[PDB]
Design a protein around this nucleic acid. Structure first.
Ligand SMILES: NC[C@@H]1O[C@H](O[C@H]2[C@@H](O)[C@H](O[C@@H]3[C@@H](O)[C@H](N)C[C@H](N)[C@H]3O[C@H]3O[C@H](CO)[C@@H](O)[C@H](O)[C@H]3N)O[C@@H]2CO)[C@H](N)[C@@H](O)[C@@H]1O
Ligand SMILES: NC[C@@H]1O[C@H](O[C@H]2[C@@H](O)[C@H](O[C@@H]3[C@@H](O)[C@H](N)C[C@H](N)[C@H]3O[C@H]3O[C@H](CO)[C@@H](O)[C@H](O)[C@H]3N)O[C@@H]2CO)[C@H](N)[C@@H](O)[C@@H]1O
Ligand SMILES: NC[C@@H]1O[C@H](O[C@H]2[C@@H](O)[C@H](O[C@@H]3[C@@H](O)[C@H](N)C[C@H](N)[C@H]3O[C@H]3O[C@H](CO)[C@@H](O)[C@H](O)[C@H]3N)O[C@@H]2CO)[C@H](N)[C@@H](O)[C@@H]1O
Ligand SMILES: NC[C@@H]1O[C@H](O[C@H]2[C@@H](O)[C@H](O[C@@H]3[C@@H](O)[C@H](N)C[C@H](N)[C@H]3O[C@H]3O[C@H](CO)[C@@H](O)[C@H](O)[C@H]3N)O[C@@H]2CO)[C@H](N)[C@@H](O)[C@@H]1O
Ligand SMILES: NC[C@@H]1O[C@H](O[C@H]2[C@@H](O)[C@H](O[C@@H]3[C@@H](O)[C@H](N)C[C@H](N)[C@H]3O[C@H]3O[C@H](CO)[C@@H](O)[C@H](O)[C@H]3N)O[C@@H]2CO)[C@H](N)[C@@H](O)[C@@H]1O
Ligand SMILES: NC[C@@H]1O[C@H](O[C@H]2[C@@H](O)[C@H](O[C@@H]3[C@@H](O)[C@H](N)C[C@H](N)[C@H]3O[C@H]3O[C@H](CO)[C@@H](O)[C@H](O)[C@H]3N)O[C@@H]2CO)[C@H](N)[C@@H](O)[C@@H]1O
Ligand SMILES: NC[C@@H]1O[C@H](O[C@H]2[C@@H](O)[C@H](O[C@@H]3[C@@H](O)[C@H](N)C[C@H](N)[C@H]3O[C@H]3O[C@H](CO)[C@@H](O)[C@H](O)[C@H]3N)O[C@@H]2CO)[C@H](N)[C@@H](O)[C@@H]1O
Ligand SMILES: [Mg+2]
Ligand SMILES: [Mg+2]
Ligand SMILES: [Mg+2]
Ligand SMILES: [Mg+2]
Ligand SMILES: [Mg+2]
Ligand SMILES: [Mg+2]
Ligand SMILES: [Mg+2]
Ligand SMILES: [Mg+2]
Ligand SMILES: [Mg+2]
Ligand SMILES: [Mg+2]
Ligand SMILES: [Mg+2]
Ligand SMILES: [Mg+2]
Ligand SMILES: [Mg+2]
Ligand SMILES: [Mg+2]
Ligand SMILES: [Mg+2]
Ligand SMILES: [Mg+2]
Ligand SMILES: [Mg+2]
Ligand SMILES: [Mg+2]
Ligand SMILES: [Mg+2]
Ligand SMILES: [Mg+2]
Ligand SMILES: [Mg+2]
Ligand SMILES: [Mg+2]
Ligand SMILES: [Mg+2]
Ligand SMILES: [Mg+2]
Ligand SMILES: [Mg+2]
Ligand SMILES: [Mg+2]
Ligand SMILES: [Mg+2]
Ligand SMILES: [Mg+2]
Ligand SMILES: [Mg+2]
Ligand SMILES: [Mg+2]
Ligand SMILES: [Mg+2]
Ligand SMILES: [Mg+2]
Ligand SMILES: [Mg+2]
Ligand SMILES: [Mg+2]
Ligand SMILES: [Mg+2]
Ligand SMILES: [Mg+2]
Ligand SMILES: [Mg+2]
Ligand SMILES: [Mg+2]
Ligand SMILES: [Mg+2]
Ligand SMILES: [Mg+2]
Ligand SMILES: [Mg+2]
Ligand SMILES: [Mg+2]
Ligand SMILES: [Mg+2]
Ligand SMILES: [Mg+2]
Ligand SMILES: [Mg+2]
Ligand SMILES: [Mg+2]
Ligand SMILES: [Mg+2]
Ligand SMILES: [Mg+2]
Ligand SMILES: [Mg+2]
Ligand SMILES: [Mg+2]
Ligand SMILES: [Mg+2]
Ligand SMILES: [Mg+2]
Ligand SMILES: [Mg+2]
Lengths: 219, 159, 169, 294, 34, 58
RNA sequence: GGUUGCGGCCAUAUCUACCAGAAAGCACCGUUUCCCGUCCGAUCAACUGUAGUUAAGCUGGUAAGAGCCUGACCGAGUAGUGUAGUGGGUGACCAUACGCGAAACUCAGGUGCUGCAAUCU
RNA sequence: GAGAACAGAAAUCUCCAGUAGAACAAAAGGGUAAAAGCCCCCUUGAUUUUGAUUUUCAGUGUGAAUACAAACCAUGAAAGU
RNA sequence: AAGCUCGUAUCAGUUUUAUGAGGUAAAGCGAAUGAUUAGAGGUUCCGGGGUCGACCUUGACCUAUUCUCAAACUUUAAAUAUGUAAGAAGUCCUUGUUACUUAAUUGAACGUGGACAUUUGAAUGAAGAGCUUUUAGUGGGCCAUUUUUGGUAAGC
């Protein structure tokens, strides 16, 4: 079936997530939110590009899926399989309902009907605020043209308006690149898995010493 | 079927506050209520006996009776167009001591003491309150503060 | 440095876990009175296990708690049985310790075949002075960091006196 | 312990009333004493507080106030030597003593001393102080056990039978005294009247004199060098009876030096708090030590 | 004299606690060969 | 057939024509629901303070 | 000022570690005839204050400590929201007008206050 | 979590941790930690009388409930309930 | 509709000030709960098998991080809406009654006699305030903006 995406496009209903009071709902056609090279070190991938919604609406998982697949297949096969880290920034937690009048042969019914209208779960979608990021990709600054088009190539699977935005920031973190590198000389950045931990001033002096040695090279 | 029983919809309402639970302290039991006292009504979930119906939560009335563990409070609720007279028998854990009138006494008492100042001097009284006023003319010094002039900021994306 | 904190034996509970009702349980209950002279206390079954043949609330085990003079010699009796050598386990990280031996004949206790044959569990808890700080009613406190019998501390107590041994590592 | 508590734990934990954490108060019971009738309005409720330290017996007449609790007048075991007992400070007969001290002490403060005499010569039999016909009514006080576990023949109920016997109205039943037999279910005033005047402690000295001298050497070592004998004990407390009722009035210690003078010394042994400039300087220094990746 | 010591447990279920099952077992142990 | 179920529409309007009144209070309110042995003893406290003015005036 | 009996508010009072504690008090502790309670004088009971002790309970301090309390044109006049137009936009949405206005964040500071009674270099 | 003959994943015993993460017939929600939970002891306030009050409401009935009065009882050292 | 008692007594689909109550919007998830993407660190020296006559995968737990959510989640928490007070029926002083109440001339009510008005104790308005009896029609409703449920939607 899959009645068209035009029926579910607008957020018409309070979020209806899969829950204890609502079970037996299908599975998101997108299970994979992180792909490309997801283990890459923070300093490896300075440049970041976003796919940002310009509209207040609902994105279906099946659409999210084909968008993800689309971006990747271009990005990899053009630049490289490991040349980027693509993250899907939205998770389809909203459960769509259908009534499903069609039952079994041989005839439809009269006149009831609308009676007992409440629907069974149909699909999933991710309700999206204006200016909410949909996709994020981090790569090396030399890959811009390839990354900027990768998301641009994926917008065509998305209902509504979305913009490709050049992120003034380092990688998938905060800290606009100078304010990042500023804390790189002070060695306040401890590489975690595919991310960093930052050195606070707020903690116990013992572990702060052990954790970030080169910050006090000294102070 | 619809469900209208006594405490329905009170879930969050009759909850005790985050990190306040268990036994109620002794200030509540150690308070004295005579007739005419104006009291605020707020139920307490820890005490099930003698607690207000959810309607009277937040309402304030004048106690008309004093019994062993409770005080009768007369309250005014509207039904149709009129106020009928409700009287509740409520325990002390559910009764506050209303600060609404308390200041009015501290107003009258200060009014009578400022009356003796027109008795011992003879100046004009100015007893009744007056609301906030248009303010007044003033002069703002440029000395050490010279107006710094701002423009509007352009548009730039922060993410 | 170490004036009041020396040591003692808080209590020793000899536990005999039967696993069945009736005679074997009721007889093993006489064994523990002939043991400490104290009359013991049986335990009900936690939950039914049809593999072990016991419904819940079935009287099964039995044990008794002894302190002071009567325990330390019955404890000393057992240390003769396992011959003053104990393993690196058998000592809890909370400082207490215990072992077990078969037959109970090995420490005193003549046969009396009109009783029958039983083994047992020797577990014994170590404490210090100021222990009722935690165990009292009024102003119940908690034993400080120092004090607070540790594993290596009650071992260096049990190796020194009794001249016993750690084992297995 | 490596049981170390998550910040989630210590953020959402609800700390009990302080006097629960330190375990000096059962508030469940305090509500059931302090709280008065609402048609009795502001006329306060009075509790008899009985507290046994190891070396002392505390007995206080107390009412309650939202600012904090009030004590009418208080006595002690450690006052009793002034009334003639150097030894046996915390024991049943000293509880009757302190209880009968505060009975005639507080009740004197009210001008109620003369009227409402007491039980006088003490048969140890069960009775309460009834009312004067056409006159005041006994000053009503209630027993506050504190945290104390109730048992039949417990050290606290001597102060009960002492204070009740001293004119105070402190209602009770006989059954938690010694002499209530849990089959007989009535009381024997002998076993009490014995205990009231010390008829246990003395009886032990006799029996102990026989069995062990070396045990009698220390345990009673205070009675030896003070020239005190076995059945002399009966008259130690029987005398203090007349002495209590004689001068119930409270004279305090004259407490050499003063208030201000104590404080000038009596804690110089507490540390001062730092300022932020102090703690911050240390931190910057504590870095220098621990620094260098060591 | 049968003196029983009572359980402080609030659990009135006859179900064995789910700390126990055919799983969590071990292919090891000193199975006697003699 | 099916029809309307409920509404509050227009009811605020109707209840404001003649409406909303007020508790219409007096001094010396009724004693309804006051402690009996107050209102019992209160009778004799007033029964007695009557004779006090059945004497004083003469 | 310490200390204790009863407290009010009930984390600025809780947790974790580590030190320091004179005086007095508190305890820890000795005792098992008597009332008394337990499988067990461990808890409860009673005797003694005598045989011993700050090791602990307890009270303080220390921690770029956890948590908690506090402040601010910190973020934010942001989110939201009351009123308004024949405002914009195909719509989804959005702007402006007259008002009300957060929580997260951040920087900063603080870590029980105190009643009645008694007592102590 | 760390510890004890058979005893194993699961028997019984111990210590430490444990803001409730358990239990309170049941639906769900609220409430409770020296308790409202577990356990033991004693009882029949699940009683008499007859009015008032809250919810629903027409301010009728009914169901349920709250605070009293007048008795007579239970319980506890008691205040109390 | 008929009036009746009175003549500014009392009010009020409004604000101001004082004082309550509420758990929606928003917000929060390196806070509880429930869900949810990704790596990194650390014990099992394994729950289980191998490589070897103890090293690597698999999982299970654990530690600090990371992406995204909730009508029937939540520490926090609006706007709008909402109970109360702003007096002569007031604030006090004294001391008569009672069978209630207290250790009690303690209280509790209710009185006796007495102190104080002039902004008499916020603004604004009042076409007058209160009261009673009787009786018609009606008891299919629909529409706009906004909040909102079911439904792909509807002039549903
Ligand atoms: N697009 C046409 C839509 O159908 C409407 O009318 C529908 C029906 O009312 C009308 O009658 C159809 C008939 O044509 C068709 N061949 C057989 C069908 N059973 C009939 O419909 C009938 O039966 C159905 C099902 O039981 C029920 O809706 C009802 O009893 C009745 N409408 O035909 C349409 C469907 O076939 C109107 N034509 C129109 O206003 C509306 O927009
Ligand atoms: N789905 C289509 C429509 O969506 C609308 O959605 C509106 C609401 O979700 C929300 O509107 C809020 C409103 O709820 C709230 N009660 C008042 C607030 N001023 C409005 O705000 C909104 O509208 C105003 C209009 O000038 C804009 O200025 C503002 O930027 C915008 N956020 O924002 C949307 C309009 O911007 C309405 N739900 C309704 O008309 C209809 O469902
Ligand atoms: N402006 C102050 C604020 O608004 C209010 O303060 C005052 C007024 O704004 C408020 O007026 C409200 C009105 O909003 C709404 N109509 C509800 C209520 N009926 C009115 O209040 C008044 O109503 C009538 C007189 O009109 C009186 O019978 C009633 O006693 C009185 N409270 O009455 C309040 C007291 O006179 C709120 N109390 C509070 O949010 C806050 O004080
Ligand atoms: N309460 C006073 C106010 O606190 C405010 O601060 C609020 C927040 O900044 C503070 O949040 C702290 C956070 O700073 C700190 N770095 C971590 C801590 N867990 C947070 O705590 C807070 O949030 C967590 C959930 O994240 C809750 O579990 C916790 O109960 C809450 N206090 O919680 C405070 C409220 O409790 C402001 N500093 C200021 O308006 C004022 O000081
Ligand atoms: N990813 C690791 C694995 O996944 C699960 O655990 C994951 C989470 O469930 C767990 O997250 C945190 C936890 O770190 C923390 N120390 C305690 C916290 N309550 C947990 O919370 C988790 O569950 C709660 C609901 O109970 C959610 O609200 C929350 O979003 C979720 N992170 O930590 C893990 C990583 O986030 C499995 N329980 C376990 O097998 C293992 O930890
Ligand atoms: N705002 C002040 C008011 O004063 C009022 O007081 C009024 C009345 O109580 C008082 O009336 C008294 C009356 O009490 C007493 N038993 C009889 C006496 N003749 C009346 O006197 C009054 O009425 C007569 C007759 O018309 C007039 O001649 C005389 O001027 C007038 N004082 O006269 C006052 C009017 O002048 C009320 N206490 C009350 O409404 C309010 O407090
Ligand atoms: N019960 C009989 C009644 O007792 C009344 O007296 C009792 C009380 O009403 C009277 O108290 C008076 C009170 O009447 C009057 N309206 C106010 C006055 N402040 C009170 O006085 C009270 O407080 C003061 C200290 O403030 C004490 O010194 C005094 O002893 C005390 N009674 O004191 C008595 C006990 O408290 C009157 N004598 C009378 O109405 C009648 O005889
Ligand atoms: Mg559609
Ligand atoms: Mg809908
Ligand atoms: Mg899903
Ligand atoms: Mg249906
Ligand atoms: Mg939003
Ligand atoms: Mg597009
Ligand atoms: Mg419903
Ligand atoms: Mg609340
Ligand atoms: Mg709140
Ligand atoms: Mg009930
Ligand atoms: Mg109690
Ligand atoms: Mg009299
Ligand atoms: Mg009785
Ligand atoms: Mg009796
Ligand atoms: Mg019909
Ligand atoms: Mg229709
Ligand atoms: Mg209809
Ligand atoms: Mg219907
Ligand atoms: Mg009309
Ligand atoms: Mg001992
Ligand atoms: Mg003792
Ligand atoms: Mg020390
Ligand atoms: Mg801190
Ligand atoms: Mg501060
Ligand atoms: Mg428009
Ligand atoms: Mg605006
Ligand atoms: Mg407003
Ligand atoms: Mg403000
Ligand atoms: Mg502290
Ligand atoms: Mg835990
Ligand atoms: Mg939990
Ligand atoms: Mg029950
Ligand atoms: Mg439930
Ligand atoms: Mg709950
Ligand atoms: Mg608690
Ligand atoms: Mg009674
Ligand atoms: Mg307000
Ligand atoms: Mg909510
Ligand atoms: Mg709600
Ligand atoms: Mg929300
Ligand atoms: Mg928040
Ligand atoms: Mg929860
Ligand atoms: Mg839960
Ligand atoms: Mg790993
Ligand atoms: Mg805040
Ligand atoms: Mg008089
Ligand atoms: Mg006018
Ligand atoms: Mg009509
Ligand atoms: Mg009709
Ligand atoms: Mg019709
Ligand atoms: Mg229509
Ligand atoms: Mg139409
Ligand atoms: Mg149209």
């Amino acid at each position: 079936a899959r009645r068209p995406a035009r029926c579910y496009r607008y957020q018409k209903n309070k979020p209806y997530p899969k829950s204890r009071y609502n079970r037996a709902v299908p599975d998101s056609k997108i299970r994979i939110y992180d792909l490309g090279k997801k283990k890459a070190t923070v300093d490896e991938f300075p440049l970041c590009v976003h796919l940002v919604s310009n509209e207040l609406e609902q994105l279906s998982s099946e659409a999210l899926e084909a968008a993800r697949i689309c971006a990747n297949k271009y990005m990899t096969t053009v630049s490289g399989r490991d040349a980027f880290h693509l993250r899907v920034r939205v998770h389809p937690f909203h459960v769509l309902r259908i009534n499903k009048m069609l039952s079994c042969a041989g005839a439809d019914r009269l006149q009831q009907g609308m009676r007992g209208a409440w629907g069974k779960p149909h699909g999933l979608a991710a309700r999206v605020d204006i200016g909410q990021i949909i996709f994020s990709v981090r790569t090396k600054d030399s890959n811009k043209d390839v990354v900027v088009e990768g998301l641009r190539r994926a917008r065509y699977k998305f209902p509504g308006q979305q913009k490709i935005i050049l992120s003034k920031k380092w990688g998938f973190t905060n800290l606009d690149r100078p304010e990042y590198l500023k804390k790189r000389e002070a060695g306040e950045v401890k590489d975690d898995g595919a991310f960093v931990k930052f050195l606070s001033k707020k903690g116990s002096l013992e572990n702060n010493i052990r954790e970030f040695p080169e910050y006090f090279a000294a102070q | 079927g619809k469900s209208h029983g006594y405490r329905s919809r009170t879930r969050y309402m009759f909850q005790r506050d985050f990190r306040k639970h268990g036994a109620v302290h002794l200030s509540t039991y150690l308070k004295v209520y005579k007739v005419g006292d104006i009291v605020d009504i707020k139920a307490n979930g820890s005490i099930q006996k003698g607690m207000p119906h959810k309607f009277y939560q937040g309402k304030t009335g004048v106690v008309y009776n004093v019994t062993k563990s409770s005080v009768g409070v007369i309250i005014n609720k509207m039904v149709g167009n009129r106020y009928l007279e409700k009287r509740l028998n409520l325990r002390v854990e559910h009764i506050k001591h209303s600060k609404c009138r308390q200041e009015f006494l501290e107003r009258v008492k200060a009014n009578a003491a400022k009356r003796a100042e027109a008795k011992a001097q003879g100046v004009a009284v100015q007893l009744k309150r007056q609301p906030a006023q248009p303010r007044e003319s003033r002069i703002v010094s440029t000395e050490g503060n010279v107006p710094q002039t701002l423009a509007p900021v352009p548009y730039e994306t922060f993410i | 440095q170490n004036p009041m904190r020396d040591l003692k034996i808080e209590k020793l509970v000899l536990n005999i876990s039967v696993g069945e009702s009736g005679d074997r349980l009721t007889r093993a209950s006489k064994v523990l009175e002939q043991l400490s002279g104290q009359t013991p206390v049986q335990s009900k079954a936690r939950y039914t296990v049809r593999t072990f043949g016991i419904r819940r609330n079935e009287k099964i085990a039995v044990h008794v708690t002894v302190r002071g003079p009567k325990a330390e010699e019955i404890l000393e009796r057992g240390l003769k049985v396992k011959e003053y050598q104990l393993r690196d386990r058998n000592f809890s990280a909370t400082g207490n310790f215990g072992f077990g031996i078969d037959e109970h004949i090995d420490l005193g206790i003549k046969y009396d075949p009109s009783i029958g044959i039983f083994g047992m569990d020797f577990y014994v808890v170590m404490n210090r002075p100021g222990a009722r700080v935690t165990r009292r009613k009024r102003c119940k406190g908690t034993v400080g960091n120092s004090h607070k019998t540790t594993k290596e501390d009650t071992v260096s107590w049990f190796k020194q006196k009794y001249d016993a041994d750690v084992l297995d590592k | 312990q490596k049981d170390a508590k998550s910040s989630a734990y210590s953020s959402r934990f609800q700390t009990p009333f302080r006097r629960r954490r330190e375990g000096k108060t059962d508030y469940y019971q305090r509500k059931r004493l302090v709280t008065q009738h609402k048609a009795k309005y502001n006329t306060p409720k009075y509790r008899l507080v009985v507290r046994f330290t190891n070396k002392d017996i505390i007995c206080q007449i107390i009412s309650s106030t939202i600012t904090g609790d009030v004590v009418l007048a208080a006595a002690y075991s450690h006052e009793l030597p002034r009334y003639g007992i150097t030894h046996g400070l915390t024991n049943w007969a000293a509880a009757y003593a302190t209880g009968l001290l505060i009975a005639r002490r507080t009740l004197q403060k009210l001008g109620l001393d003369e009227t409402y005499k007491g039980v006088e010569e003490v048969e140890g039999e069960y009775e309460l102080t009834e009312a004067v016909e056409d006159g005041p009514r006994p000053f009503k006080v209630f027993l506050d056990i504190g945290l104390q576990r109730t048992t039949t023949g417990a050290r606290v109920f001597g102060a009960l039978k002492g204070a009740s016997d001293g004119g105070l109205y402190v209602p009770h039943s006989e059954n938690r005294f010694p002499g209530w037999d849990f089959e007989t279910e009535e009381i024997d005033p002998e076993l009490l009247r014995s205990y009231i005047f010390g008829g246990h402690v003395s009886q032990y000295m006799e029996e102990l004199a026989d069995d062990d001298e070396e045990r009698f050497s220390e345990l009673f070592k205070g009675y030896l060098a003070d020239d005190i004998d076995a059945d002399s004990l009966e008259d130690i407390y029987t005398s203090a009876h007349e002495a209590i009722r004689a001068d119930p009035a409270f004279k305090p210690t004259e407490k050499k030096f003063t208030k201000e003078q104590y404080a000038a010394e009596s804690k110089k042994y507490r540390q001062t708090k730092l300022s932020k400039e102090e703690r911050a300087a240390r931190v910057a220094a504590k870095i220098a030590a621990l620094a260098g990746q060591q | 004299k049968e003196i029983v010591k009572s359980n402080t447990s609030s659990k009135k279920a006859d179900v064995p606690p789910p700390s126990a099952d055919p799983s969590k077992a071990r292919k090891n142990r000193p199975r006697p060969s003699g | 057939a099916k029809s309307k179920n409920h509404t509050a529409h227009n009811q605020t309007r109707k209840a404001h024509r003649n409406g909303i009144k007020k508790p219409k209070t007096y001094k010396y309110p009724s004693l309804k629901g006051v402690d009996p042995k107050f209102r019992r003893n209160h009778k004799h406290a007033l029964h007695g303070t009557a004779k006090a003015l059945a004497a004083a005036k003469k």
